[PDB]
Amino acid sequence: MYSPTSILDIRQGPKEPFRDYVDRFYKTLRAEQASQEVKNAATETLLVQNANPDCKTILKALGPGATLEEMMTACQGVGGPGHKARVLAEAMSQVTNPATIMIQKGNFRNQRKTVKCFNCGKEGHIAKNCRAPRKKGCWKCGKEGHQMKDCTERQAN
Ligand SMILES: [Zn+2]
Ligand SMILES: [Zn+2]
Secondary structure, three states: OOOOOHHHHOOOOOOOOHHHHHHHHHHHHOOOOOOHHHHHHHHHHHHHHOOOHHHHHHHHHHHHHOOOHHHHHHOOOOOOOOOHHHHHHHHHHHHHOOHHHHHHHHOOOOOOHHHOOOOOOOOOOOOOOOOOOOOOOOOOOOOOOOOHHHOOOOOOO
16 A cells, blocks of 8 residues: 555655655665666756645745755755644745635645544544554554554664
């Protein structure tokens, strides 16, 4: 399941640290590095277009003040994945620019169905924060199986 067409797509999600999603692009790039000529030319526009709107937006904004690793770190944890900074920034942006209603309408095109808690079934929670042995068992290393009670995270995540 966790090896779909998304691996060919590898587009960065707004919560995803740039280099982390680029990491799995790099794992494909290291393999299919036959046409290096097209690959390198692609990666130039590809990785920047691969970013979430906000991410490529900041890249070009802080580019002058961010050499290379700096701009990479800038897009690592955009406003912090679990930080409240991003959540308030989303509200600050919302009142400031009317472009937020446009992307709000565009949100209808986006499958925002990730909110539904992948263990409880409903979107009352978020699976990222909801730690509850409801069903399925081990979602960590087995997904389809393994005892969730004996699944201690060691050299995995
Ligand atoms: Zn839940
Ligand atoms: Zn497990």
